[PDB]
Design a protein around this ligand. Structure first.
Ligand SMILES: NC(=O)c1ccc[n+]([C@@H]2O[C@H](COP(=O)([O-])OP(=O)(O)OC[C@H]3O[C@@H](n4cnc5c(N)ncnc54)[C@H](O)[C@@H]3O)[C@@H](O)[C@H]2O)c1
Ligand SMILES: NC(=O)c1ccc[n+]([C@@H]2O[C@H](COP(=O)([O-])OP(=O)(O)OC[C@H]3O[C@@H](n4cnc5c(N)ncnc54)[C@H](O)[C@@H]3O)[C@@H](O)[C@H]2O)c1
Ligand SMILES: NC(=O)c1ccc[n+]([C@@H]2O[C@H](COP(=O)([O-])OP(=O)(O)OC[C@H]3O[C@@H](n4cnc5c(N)ncnc54)[C@H](O)[C@@H]3O)[C@@H](O)[C@H]2O)c1
Ligand SMILES: NC(=O)c1ccc[n+]([C@@H]2O[C@H](COP(=O)([O-])OP(=O)(O)OC[C@H]3O[C@@H](n4cnc5c(N)ncnc54)[C@H](O)[C@@H]3O)[C@@H](O)[C@H]2O)c1
Ligand SMILES: Oc1cc(Cl)ccc1Oc1ccc(Cl)cc1Cl
Ligand SMILES: Oc1cc(Cl)ccc1Oc1ccc(Cl)cc1Cl
Ligand SMILES: Oc1cc(Cl)ccc1Oc1ccc(Cl)cc1Cl
Ligand SMILES: Oc1cc(Cl)ccc1Oc1ccc(Cl)cc1Cl
Lengths: 257, 257, 257, 257
């Protein structure tokens, strides 16, 4: 596969529906050696099982709300992978009350702070912590959504956090490019995952996209996984600082209704 | 003037160099009645003096880091302006250590949090607090910078905070439009102000822009003020959720060097 | 008014519904001296009448498909206005068969050529012809539509012509800025005009926009006219090469349905 | 390879420096069966030789300025490939006088017409002609440049033609997606090719990009070729209507100087 010889860390697997799960599958298929993190014990079991199926026994705990947790996870990873080739950041969070109803009425200073901290700061927090461990030719990848570009009902403060994240991708790419590290994002279309259930009326968003997307279907975690594998491989050596839309063309059409 | 009959609150005046000062001047010239806020006692004197020169005696303290301070300022403003027509948000902040050198090395969880809280959350915090006091036809305005769209050396975490702010403009415009409130931003080119001195090599950024901007000069607080007055007036009734570049065309050219 | 002392040429008035008509009204209200062009004799009468109502007796024929017609019109204008302050380009055209049905099936080499020639090339053709007649501080303005940015059903080849036009705005602004000329565009939302009737299902586009636009109404030629007056005045001295959306926020929202 | 079983037509090979040459090499490496076109006899020899080295004996003449030439080439291709999986459009042209100096002074109605006809219309002209021959799952690809988005000195009218081309990509993707065809573009950074020598001061553009691009080197035809192979493969099934920047991050940074 085109990922043979690469060692990549994958965050965010919570279930078989997880976008990170589709990404891990595609990268394994292409020959990458993988390592996984899990947020807490509530998820340790499932992640350990999935990692086994994908030939990996490197499963480490990591809660990105804490600098100490990130530093410890990398010190542990370093015992087996003193150097590696990048990681996939597939993590997002905002308190549930933030994602329902009128945005101005729903947002709070605390909800805003947590959404940006976990959904955007954590990406550069991880890069800071493992910077000296990355091989030249390494690639970092995060996942965004159209809500960063347009106002979407109910997505609310997560939209602002994703806009901060896309800017993060550009500043990170500009800072780390000289040492040989590329940084990109995939702006994925709507997919039924555990976290998606937290967005009010998500099922309605899904049906709408299916009807108006140029390719006439919503994307799958396999579609996203294949794109992620490409973006973390040497085949995309000429691409950095980019937000690639993997939504079947939904965002470039208007009034298809 | 085209602002006759409008009552507008202006935040951010710190000196005669302040963009908010140029905005206040232009709005006064066009007939608006004004009210001003000041961050702390270190600035109370200058703001009181400027307000007098512009025919206003409404000068209130307001530190947007605190919900209580925002609520109190509006309760006080309500004693004289039970209803009004919008406000100008010209406030930004990030700890100084954040704006020097390599972005990944300089950014910290705390610096990131403060930058987003003061530079982006505060805009919707103010709208939440005065929502019931706005007249139909009201307009809110904030100030952004190109760093939200492109990676610019030294601007660092402020770029991410401005990206969150531009997204804020869109979600706010979408939420408040039905009740008759418009929300926009001006992305201004570089101008020598007090805060600008905190950006490493700002004088270099200024000279560069002057040489490559299509109109061959950097913009002034008068240029920005005139645009702000238009965007807060009924003359721009058809514009909401927009980020207008007032940088002399700098951002739409490349390689003019 | 803020246009006092300015001499502006207005193209494209075909009826009282014309966007150019709303623009002429607003500029006259703000004090500008105006001059008008008309495409052919089929329209001469109406334009002569409107010009009179707006205190102007400068009404010249000009068909932008011909270089000779443009050169002659300016030589004639020069007899009364040896120098002037800019013009409004409110002209578009594509053969009717191009605007109905599947884009790939409808487009032809000839339809494509005519659409780009009349809708985009004509803007720089006029600037080339009157370049030596423009006063420093002059401003040129054209009208675009969201179809330049997103694929919209039935708009078809006009979308490509508008994309070429928006690029034209940037190259023109970059080339003419050093001599003191600004160039911008307004991307207007849907408005019932004579030309609009040529777009299949235009009435459907109008109703849809009204329902999902943040300000909850479609824009009027007065909204566009007011913005145009501002953009051609010295109040927008800091703005060049920009495409300003005057569509009530329609383009920055998604899934409001 | 991930292109095994795909039959792709490649246009634009003129020499070993050609972007189309790098694309053909990468696609051959990944298992695609290829076919090539050549503009005229001046190029027939070189193309025949290259095609042989890549295991292909399908080399057909095609000048996209003529509808008849396009129809004939496809009728001939149909004798060997009654159905196929897409094509690569790597064709551009504008008269040389258009690419030197001030844009407004250099552009002519004829130069503008030819630039748009050959550089943008030809892409949809080819799709129209072979539409019934494409297998479900097919993908079309064209090559663009940053000049479509920003004003770049000397690129002049080609910038407008590339803006029309990027819009073409979106309208084509929207029209053909329902039948299973994806359409995308790669916006490549500067590369020394035969056509590049026609741009005044191209060597200066190249050195500048090398110094300020995040990855600190200009991209190669191999970088572009690898991205093109991915975008024409089933691995990018979730991507359509997109313009992917393969310029090492150059466009997302500002003032790196
Ligand atoms: N689902 C969609 O339609 C969609 C669309 C675009 C983007 N995304 C993005 O894709 C990513 C993955 O989401 P998903 O839909 O696969 O959801 P998911 O619920 O399968 O995964 C989200 C993951 O975030 C992790 N997470 C949350 N807080 C964390 C913390 N403090 N520390 C460590 N991990 C934490 C969870 O443990 C979980 O594995 C997110 O960035 C999301 O915003 C999803
Ligand atoms: N100066 C430039 O070139 C430029 C370019 C683009 C945008 N801007 C933006 O314009 C706005 C005004 O900046 P400026 O350059 O006029 O600077 P300035 O230093 O004159 O004004 C900044 C203001 O922010 C206020 N402020 C900071 N923290 C605050 C808090 N907690 N509560 C209340 N007020 C607080 C200060 O008191 C001060 O009045 C900012 O949003 C800035 O990001 C400036
Ligand atoms: N109507 C809308 O909803 C809308 C939305 C966005 C942009 N626009 C743009 O606004 C401009 C004005 O359109 P409108 O809707 O007011 O239509 P309209 O039919 O009132 O005006 C179009 C004008 O184009 C002129 N014209 C066409 N070919 C010409 C030629 N060869 N030479 C000289 N003049 C020529 C006509 O004479 C007419 O005055 C166009 O650029 C159009 O694309 C309209
Ligand atoms: N070279 C760069 O730095 C760069 C950057 C971005 C985009 N591009 C684009 O990549 C494509 C390929 O350019 P290149 O640099 O490889 O140049 P090149 O000179 O190697 O190839 C250009 C090709 O266009 C073909 N062509 C021109 N007119 C034609 C006509 N009427 N019919 C058929 N074929 C015709 C030529 O025969 C030639 O093979 C163009 O679209 C160009 O705009 C090049
Ligand atoms: O970003 C997303 C976008 C979509 Cl359409 C669906 C799910 C997404 O992911 C999340 C949404 C809300 C929260 Cl609280 C956490 C996550 Cl991970
Ligand atoms: O956003 C800005 C952009 C520029 Cl070019 C100059 C000054 C700016 O404003 C600030 C920059 C840094 C900090 Cl700490 C605070 C503020 Cl108000
Ligand atoms: O650009 C437009 C956009 C809209 Cl929504 C409505 C009308 C427009 O203007 C035209 C549309 C088609 C043709 Cl043939 C000519 C013109 Cl002037
Ligand atoms: O688009 C291009 C962009 C760059 Cl930076 C270099 C070469 C390019 O390609 C061309 C440029 C001019 C002409 Cl006349 C023809 C072609 Cl193919």
């Amino acid at each position: 596969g085109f990922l043979s010889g690469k060692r990549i860390l994958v965050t965010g697997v919570a279930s078989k529906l997880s976008i990170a799960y589709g990404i891990a599958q595609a990268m394994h298929r292409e020959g990458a050696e993988l390592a996984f993190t899990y947020q807490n014990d509530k998820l340790k079991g499932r992640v350990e099982e999935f990692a086994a199926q994908l030939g990996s026994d490197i499963v480490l705990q990591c809660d990105v709300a804490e600098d100490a947790s990130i530093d410890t996870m990398f010190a542990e990873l370093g015992k087996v992978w003193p150097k590696f080739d990048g990681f996939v950041h597939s993590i997002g969070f905002a308190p549930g009350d933030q994602l329902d109803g009128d945005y101005v009425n729903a947002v709070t200073r605390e909800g805003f702070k947590i959404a940006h901290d976990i959904s955007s700061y954590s990406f550069v927090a991880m890069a800071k912590a493992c910077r000296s461990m990355l091989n030249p030719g390494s690639a970092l990848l995060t996942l965004s959504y159209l809500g960063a570009e347009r106002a979407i009902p109910n997505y609310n403060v997560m939209g602002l956090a994703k806009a901060s994240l896309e800017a993060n991708v550009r500043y990170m790419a500009n800072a780390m490019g000289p040492e040989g590290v590329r940084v990109n994002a995939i702006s994925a279309g709507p997919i039924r995952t555990l976290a998606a259930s937290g967005i009010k009326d998500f099922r309605k968003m899904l049906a709408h996209c299916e009807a108006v997307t140029p390719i006439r279907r919503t994307v799958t975690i396999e579609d996203v996984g294949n794109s992620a594998a490409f973006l973390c491989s040497d085949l995309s050596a000429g691409i950095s600082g980019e937000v690639v839309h993997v939504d079947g063309g939904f965002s470039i059409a208007a009034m298809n209704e």
